[PDB]
Design a protein around this ligand. Structure first.
Ligand SMILES: O=C(O)[C@]1(O)C=C(CCO)[C@@H](O)[C@H](O)C1
Ligand SMILES: O=C(O)[C@]1(O)C=C(CCO)[C@@H](O)[C@H](O)C1
Ligand SMILES: O=C(O)[C@]1(O)C=C(CCO)[C@@H](O)[C@H](O)C1
Ligand SMILES: O=C(O)[C@]1(O)C=C(CCO)[C@@H](O)[C@H](O)C1
Ligand SMILES: O=C(O)[C@]1(O)C=C(CCO)[C@@H](O)[C@H](O)C1
Ligand SMILES: O=C(O)[C@]1(O)C=C(CCO)[C@@H](O)[C@H](O)C1
Ligand SMILES: O=C(O)[C@]1(O)C=C(CCO)[C@@H](O)[C@H](O)C1
Ligand SMILES: O=C(O)[C@]1(O)C=C(CCO)[C@@H](O)[C@H](O)C1
Ligand SMILES: O=C(O)[C@]1(O)C=C(CCO)[C@@H](O)[C@H](O)C1
Ligand SMILES: O=C(O)[C@]1(O)C=C(CCO)[C@@H](O)[C@H](O)C1
Ligand SMILES: O=C(O)[C@]1(O)C=C(CCO)[C@@H](O)[C@H](O)C1
Ligand SMILES: O=C(O)[C@]1(O)C=C(CCO)[C@@H](O)[C@H](O)C1
Ligand code: NA
Ligand code: NA
Ligand code: NA
Ligand code: NA
Ligand code: NA
Ligand code: NA
Ligand code: NA
Ligand code: NA
Ligand code: NA
Ligand code: NA
Ligand code: NA
Ligand code: NA
Ligand code: NA
Ligand code: NA
Ligand code: NA
Ligand code: NA
Ligand code: NA
Ligand code: NA
Ligand code: NA
Ligand code: NA
Ligand code: NA
Ligand code: NA
Ligand code: NA
Ligand code: NA
Ligand code: NA
Ligand code: NA
Ligand code: NA
Ligand code: NA
Ligand code: NA
Ligand code: NA
Ligand code: NA
Ligand code: NA
Ligand code: NA
Ligand code: NA
Ligand code: NA
Ligand code: NA
Lengths: 141, 141, 141, 141, 141, 141, 141, 141, 141, 141, 141, 141
């Protein structure tokens, strides 16, 4: 029923660099697209964004306590934060890691994720439709 | 309209190991699920499997010449074949790389792909629904 | 006389995963155990926890200015934060690094600490008694 | 005209360790020196410091939206934060990375920067005059 | 009740280098301190030292057969001996690894231990009080 | 008073590749700019260039014997010559290492310098103004 | 009762290089020796060779479905094929990996095997008697 | 007299990607150019291409038995196949390895060849004339 | 005729850990099995075990002087001792290295042997039958 | 029309070591062979050799200014000199790198070249005919 | 006056392998040569050999307590023993490390020494005269 | 009879840094000491120094042609020059590599030598007596 979509650092800046990297959809448009899709699927999507690791951790803690699934795009913290990994390892419902860009076609440091080994699955490089596809996985799960 | 789904070595063996690793769906069931989904999406899915790298290359060559999109699960060749990478780099339509298992939760050698850097995107660890989600991306693309 | 016990990200979640990883004592129980032990030793323990690196840094800054000893369990930041290391290098009184779990029996990335080289000493894998043993070292120091 | 000087974790502690590492100038003195130099150059310097990555990111976001140049000394986050790198990659005006100490004469982990590849340039080991020299580059740019 | 304290190569030389590295307590004084503490705790400590790996192995074998806990400071063999690791993996009662010096502040080769992954826990850099603190852990265990 | 500016291999070729890499100023123009700036600062700049390591070493030897400061852009020898490093380690007055290009944005092999650890400081990626900024540091030093 | 002996690329060329590397027995002689030994042991040996990975995979698939033991000398694919590893991981009866030459005395790349971690055991450097010794292990198993 | 030219995976696709990578000559044109050159040199060139490793191995086996020289462009198998290396090590006449593209200017994984250490020589980056130049070496050999 | 079987550290402890790792046969049973097999083969087996490297070296020295073959299971010293390697390099008769467990399925540090490159051959993971199979190789040699 | 052949350190010593490494042709003979071939091709070859990096750089500078092609065998500087690489990157006409010996069959340090990534192409292991084959490429270019 | 010459594992076997590796002088001859040279120099040489690390450590301990210089050829323990390094770090008089063979021309693992960083100096590859040359250094020291 | 002593970059600067690194003997004093010792040994020592690699190479070439032994202290080129290695590999008489300082106690980059693998032997850390000891080896050779 309830799905948490959690976006990390810099994801509030969607639609401000060249559409080359992350597409032309803004974060507000993203929230709207996700909500619309979620309703069609008979889910409720709670979509939140923060540039603060501590805030992200608190959202993951609540999802852990509620046994709610998480779609998480951690931004740069994907590649650097053990703390985020430790919080996500508490989750009992599925965790789908999403990257808008194809990280495997960028710098080598983006090709490692602390989150992938503990996630249910990972979607990269399908732009913002990656979130919609994750919702749909969760609706069937 | 037409989408090629190409499965590589050992994928014909789906449903024969413990459902732990790859799920309980057989390859024939997979073909059927994909075809059914593709028709609902108004696509035609051509689904093929081989344990022979040369056969896989020939299928990729035809997709390149037809400018058709490919959903490719290369099995073990993901981690080892430059030749497959070179064939896939000719593709002008999208290439979505799919892994049934979450390779990031397994041996370290499964965490490298020669295909990811040239793919449009990658879906891992969502089981066979990963193919269905790729079809759906392509139907919107 | 005064000892600061500083816990970092996710340590507020003690007692919520399987007792396998970190034991069944909660953070509030931990505070209570530490305070009781500290009083028996004729010390005052100030025990604080935050998931925010900036808050942790500020607590370390105050300990540096007061020349007070610190028992620090930085959680995931142990393995990732140079900033925390830089703050701890100002400390003139002892710094004892504590890990509840035996990090050497877990993932390889947990086997590196930015803090160990600048700490007085390190206690790992003795569960929450690791804090009590650190207090006792400080009472004799 | 307007230049942002952004200092990251622990830079508020300038003048509190042995003058060996970072010199004897405090952060307030630094702000004053920079402002005085900036006025002589006919610039306005906005100088800000935070130990919070999220706050640093927000300052970089504003500089990106205003197309203003940034002189950035990220402290320990230089060596660890992809998120900071991603925010700085939006900047369209110059980015000069500054380190007070000669990081190349210290620990090996200080010899890598996530920021250098996307900066216009880098000044290290010239103490606080490194900021003044960056201002002067920007006044001619 | 019975605890074995086993010291490896060069530990008989305690109190002969500058107090900088290992302190000014000799091995005989160490035995005496440990015995006194053990009696206060209502334990019996059997404290033994050898520069011979084979002798150390035989002591570990006996502790394994008696199901007795071991506090082990293996000296240089910590970083080099698989054989010692294999003997210690038989132990069914706790194994606490102790280093007098903070190995993390010395040469990089001292930062790896073959023993840590199989030990219950590890205490480093607290000087000879590290042994006393291990005894106290065992008295509560 | 006297400052030596020493340029190494290929720096005589300034202004001959695309202005992309090193700018459009020639070496003769560079000498002129440096001299003009030095006079304004009340310094005398002795500016020399050679493609011969032995000649560079001899210039560094003379600066060492005269206790004169050196601004050194060693070209490709930055990344390869221990001999140059050994000569520069004799210098008792400051050594400022200068790179015209941002080496951190180029090939990985340009990101290591044998000179940085023994230099007073390093300026990269500020083009030829990097020399002028070094002069100004020295005038205040 | 039934044992499959599977030889991979280039093993059909036995007896054609200097007897230094692989001995002077041809593949046909090898088949004959194995059959003779197998009969003495009261086993039936099915001995097959191919330079085609796909053919090797199909033979391993059949052994998996029949629950038959495999003695496998994969030739160069030992060091390179994940696909072969994946097929061999299905085997429920024993898998003995055999190398005629002592791979540990040759190039470093021959010292890694994708098969060893999933094999029951490995025999190297005992020439063709390695096959006979594997048969004998299986006859007792 | 007789020279074998053997092309591996994807070389049948010459002239189908942008002329940037491999030139605009097709494989059929290549065969024709080689034959014409060979006749001028008084040689007979047997030119063959396959995407199948097993087929390539069989061609190398025949060249080994006939003591005929080989010009080999193995495509992606250059970087991945030990089996191909093992077959080529049987060759008693010269082996010239040819790459159309300059592999040293591409991805790092293309800069390693299993074939180079056992080849007589290697020609890279001279396009299809690399084959013609190899023929000419063999005509003088 | 005479074969030396030499077992190193911890091999006297066979049959004392879970049969999972090394089987349920004790060292005395092993000696008996080997002797019985050796007599059937018309050999004399001299079987010795020590936890002392110096004792092992002396046994290898005697085998070198007598030109007698050695079956050696060095235990943990396999992975760590150059001295043992140097002694074994004197042997003129065959040296067969034996491991009871499949070291390739355990920790990565067990996957390197200082002995394999100088051994005639290596048998791993066939339990105690590995010794019997080595005897049989030697009886035919 | 004009082609520069530039030989680096030790190439003046051709014909003085065992013909095993570099052949029996001296440098003077090499000059003569190249000149004769060049005339047959209707080219003029200017062939020069120096053990001085600075002299080599000056020759490359002149070829850059004249837009003349270079055949360069840099000797040991191939593997060590960034300065040479930087000079060769100015060349607008083709650069063919030549090695007489097959560097891939020698020490590992000879398998890296700073020149290959910026060269048009590379010929190794064809002895002195490698120069003649490069001339012929240039005559067709 | 008194100099200790300490030889480690396998050095008692001098003169038993091909004179290629270590020369044809036996250990007894070596003792005699050293004694004769020492007397000519007006020194007393105490020459001892053991294959037991513990015995070597005890000899080093005595040299440390007597403040006597040591010439040490540790054999294979050079490359493997931290314990030996720790004992040698107590020595206050000079420590000269000697290797008979040129370890730099052998396996790569022989090119690392735990002893070199703490030795006064090192002599390798001068055969047994290396000991005589060390004595002579000590006689002048 | 004749021995060449060849000193490389910066060795003309002996006696100008703190006696800590290289001692207080100047190069002229060194020449004098060597000559005096050589005469006592009935040798003639030709002692030469240059900061120019090309000059060093030419001296090594002459020693190769005269079949004269070389004592070589290459300075920083020890760690960086393949060209020097290639010249020294021609030498048929002994080559003794000498370092005044103990390079193993300094930076890690000084612990690799391109010369050691081809030298007869190596003396490090015995100061200038290292040259005298090399002469004496050569007088007995
Ligand atoms: O592609 C993504 O969605 C991504 O997770 C996002 C960011 C930051 C986006 O501004 C980057 O830090 C990640 O490396 C990739
Ligand atoms: O998870 C998958 O789908 C996968 O692509 C498939 C195989 C082989 C499946 O038998 C494995 O070789 C890959 O590592 C992962
Ligand atoms: O064992 C610990 O106490 C530890 O410091 C704590 C955490 C996070 C605890 O939730 C982990 O991030 C550390 O790796 C180990
Ligand atoms: O030298 C600097 O200015 C520096 O950026 C600052 C800090 C933290 C300063 O307390 C360190 O974390 C950096 O490694 C170096
Ligand atoms: O600090 C310790 O107690 C230590 O275990 C002891 C020794 C040898 C002590 O002489 C060293 O070999 C270890 O690296 C650290
Ligand atoms: O950017 C510079 O100034 C630099 O020092 C110069 C050269 C050579 C310039 O032709 C290059 O070799 C360095 O890598 C960068
Ligand atoms: O020694 C063997 O049997 C071996 O498996 C065989 C081959 C190919 C044999 O031609 C090689 O590819 C392997 O590295 C070793
Ligand atoms: O440049 C070549 O000729 C090359 O051998 C060919 C291929 C495949 C060509 O489609 C690539 O796989 C090689 O890396 C380079
Ligand atoms: O499997 C074996 O026989 C083995 O040689 C034995 C030991 C020690 C056995 O107690 C281990 O040290 C080796 O790694 C593996
Ligand atoms: O093979 C060659 O031509 C080569 O370029 C030449 C030399 C020096 C030749 O004396 C070596 O330094 C190179 O590694 C290989
Ligand atoms: O060359 C030597 O003297 C040496 O120290 C001796 C031995 C053992 C000699 O049998 C080897 O273990 C060392 O690697 C080299
Ligand atoms: O110790 C030596 O003699 C040495 O060869 C000399 C130099 C340069 C001396 O100024 C250094 O470059 C070497 O690393 C060490
Ligand atoms: Na919620
Ligand atoms: Na991970
Ligand atoms: Na999209
Ligand atoms: Na199709
Ligand atoms: Na890749
Ligand atoms: Na699924
Ligand atoms: Na406090
Ligand atoms: Na560290
Ligand atoms: Na506890
Ligand atoms: Na502003
Ligand atoms: Na980077
Ligand atoms: Na300053
Ligand atoms: Na006991
Ligand atoms: Na370990
Ligand atoms: Na203490
Ligand atoms: Na001057
Ligand atoms: Na350095
Ligand atoms: Na500029
Ligand atoms: Na069968
Ligand atoms: Na593996
Ligand atoms: Na055999
Ligand atoms: Na043919
Ligand atoms: Na290779
Ligand atoms: Na061409
Ligand atoms: Na015997
Ligand atoms: Na080895
Ligand atoms: Na068994
Ligand atoms: Na010319
Ligand atoms: Na390169
Ligand atoms: Na030739
Ligand atoms: Na003595
Ligand atoms: Na060391
Ligand atoms: Na000798
Ligand atoms: Na001479
Ligand atoms: Na080398
Ligand atoms: Na001296």
């Amino acid at each position: 029923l309830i799905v948490n979509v959690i976006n990390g650092p810099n994801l509030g800046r969607l639609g401000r660099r060249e559409p080359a990297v992350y597409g032309g959809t803004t974060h507000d448009e993203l929230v709207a697209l996700i909500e619309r899709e979620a309703a069609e699927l008979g889910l409720k999507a709670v979509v939140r964004q923060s540039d603060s690791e501590a805030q992200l951790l608190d959202w993951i803690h609540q999802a852990a306590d509620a046994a709610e699934p998480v779609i998480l795009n951690a931004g740069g913290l994907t590649h650097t934060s053990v703390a985020l990994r430790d919080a996500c390892a508490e989750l009992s419902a599925p965790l789908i890691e999403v990257h808008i860009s194809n990280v495997h076609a960028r710098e080598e440091f983006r090709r490692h994720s602390y989150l992938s080994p503990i996630a249910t699955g990972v979607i990269v490089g399908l732009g913002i439709q990656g979130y919609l596809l994750a919702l749909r996985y969760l609706a069937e799960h």
